[PDB]
Design a protein around this ligand. Structure first.
Ligand SMILES: COc1ccc([C@@H]2Sc3ccccc3N(CCN(C)C)C(=O)[C@@H]2OC(C)=O)cc1
Length: 453
């Protein structure tokens, strides 16, 4: 067999594109850059933990990290009258009376590597642009979920697949060379236009190469290829501390695999949209399936982004959480053939919602319990997604199955568009608000799931 390994490699290469923002876009601690502070520190011998205390504005009640991240004291540090023990005491009687200003002179990031945030200065006022990086990719997924069918209708299937692979590889390689943010967003959108199209085309091909009597195992293996790709992305991210190097090391393997994938012997081998709603039972099924797809995509992406934004040891937490899918995949494989798909999916959704709810009250120092809860939630959502990827095949007849899959999977992309703004922006108002929303969505999805036959 040759198609199996190469198609699993193709599926594994989709993971760094989808969840790569966790390592390409990490946000280190930062503060306003102020000239003259370096020379004063050299004169006074200030350690980094001492300079970060003397100059950068301190934390207020309940944290309030904004005053240090986006503001600075407008004081002429060049004056020699400043005391080496404490320069702020010679300025004014009260520290709160000193003038305040934005980071006009730049930023200082406490990290040896770099990311898009550290290079394009997507912090404070510009910090809302980081969500746009994922939103553009999800918009590309949404557009490719509808344009790829027409493209493959007007063009040869294998040639269209080859063209999409080539375009994806070229776009991924080109992104690492972007000189500014707008061009990078253009390449991100172009890559997202073809990434999900390639994934679905590979799914269809791998389900065609094996008869309908064994599609489950094939689909589960294709899914676990994504977990293998996540593990490889974690390894590469640990090895390479800069985002351009990681982008090259991610995109290049696909292009080189294209050089080896010229031709293989097994390669060359109307329903109406209104029909889904004219009948009450099918309308109910379509509504429930759309809601479940949206909720599961929101929960999965939100959990990964929250882990990326809040975990204190990102590499090990990502490595642990990624490995839990494989036991989840095996659990799903055992469960489907024995006790059906409805109850297991409902229980997985309930477990995910409960895990989201419990995680709110955990103190920050209990990292060993927080990671266990995160792993449980990830296993729950993984099992739920595995179940829902197979239930759709039964409720829809072959006459309208492909249209139903295309329609239902389109809401996942809208959820992907909405999700970054929920995770990143609502966290400003209250750190527990995204967790509350995720818990509510998970519990509601668990409740509604019982209605499916
Ligand atoms: C009918 O066949 C399909 C297959 C896959 C999907 C999307 S593709 C996607 C895009 C971005 C992030 C994750 C995913 N994964 C992969 C999940 N991993 C555990 C493998 C899904 O399963 C998505 O569906 C969801 C979210 O429920 C839709 C329809």
């Amino acid at each position: 067999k040759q198609a199996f390994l190469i198609l699993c490699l193709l599926s594994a290469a989709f993971a760094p594109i989808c969840v790569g923002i966790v390592f390409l876009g990490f946000t280190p601690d930062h503060h306003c850059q102020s000239p003259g502070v370096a020379e004063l520190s050299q004169r006074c011998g200030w350690s980094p933990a001492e300079e970060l205390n003397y100059t950068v504005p301190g934390l207020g009640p309940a944290g309030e990290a904004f005053l240090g991240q986006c503001r600075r004291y407008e004081v002429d540090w060049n004056q020699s009258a400043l005391s080496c023990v404490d320069p702020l005491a010679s300025l004014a009687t009260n520290r709160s009376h000193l003038p305040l200003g934005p980071c006009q002179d730049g930023w200082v990031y406490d990290t040896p590597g770099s990311s898009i945030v550290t290079e394009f200065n997507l912090v404070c006022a510009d910090s809302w642009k980081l969500d746009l990086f994922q939103s553009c990719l999800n918009a590309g997924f949404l557009f490719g979920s509808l344009g790829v069918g027409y493209f493959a209708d007007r063009f040869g299937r294998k040639l269209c697949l080859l063209g999409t692979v080539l375009v994806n590889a070229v776009s991924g390689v080109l992104m690492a060379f972007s000189p500014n943010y707008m061009s990078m967003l253009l390449f991100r959108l172009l890559q997202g236009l073809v990434s999900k199209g390639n994934w679905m085309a590979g799914y269809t091909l791998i389900t065609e190469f094996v008869g309908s009597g064994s599609r489950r195992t094939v689909a589960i293996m294709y899914q676990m290829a994504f977990t293998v790709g996540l593990v490889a992305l974690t390894g590469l991210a640990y090895a390479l501390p800069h985002w351009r190097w990681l982008q090259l090391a991610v995109s290049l393997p696909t292009f080189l695999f294209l050089l080896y994938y010229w031709c293989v012997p097994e390669s060359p081998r109307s329903p109406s949209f209104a029909d889904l709603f004219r009948t009450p039972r099918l309308r109910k099924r379509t509504f429930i399936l759309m809601y479940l797809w949206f909720t599961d995509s929101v929960l999965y992406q939100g959990l990964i982004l929250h882990m990326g934004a809040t975990s204190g040891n990102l590499y090990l937490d990502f490595l642990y959480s990624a490995l839990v899918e494989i036991p989840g995949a095996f659990i799903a494989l055992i469960t489907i053939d024995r006790v059906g798909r409805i109850y297991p999916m409902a229980m997985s959704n309930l477990l995910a919602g409960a895990a989201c709810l419990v995680m709110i009250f955990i103190s920050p120092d209990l990292h060993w319990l927080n990671i266990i809860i995160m792993c449980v939630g990830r296993m729950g959502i993984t099992i739920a997604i595995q179940m829902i990827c197979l239930v759709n095949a039964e409720l829809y007849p072959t006459f309208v199955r492909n249209l139903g899959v295309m329609v239902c999977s389109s809401l996942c992309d809208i959820g992907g568009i909405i999700t970054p703004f929920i995770v990143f922006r609502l966290r400003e108002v209250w750190q527990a608000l995204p967790l509350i929303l995720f818990a509510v969505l998970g519990l509601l999805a668990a409740g509604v799931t019982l209605l499916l036959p």
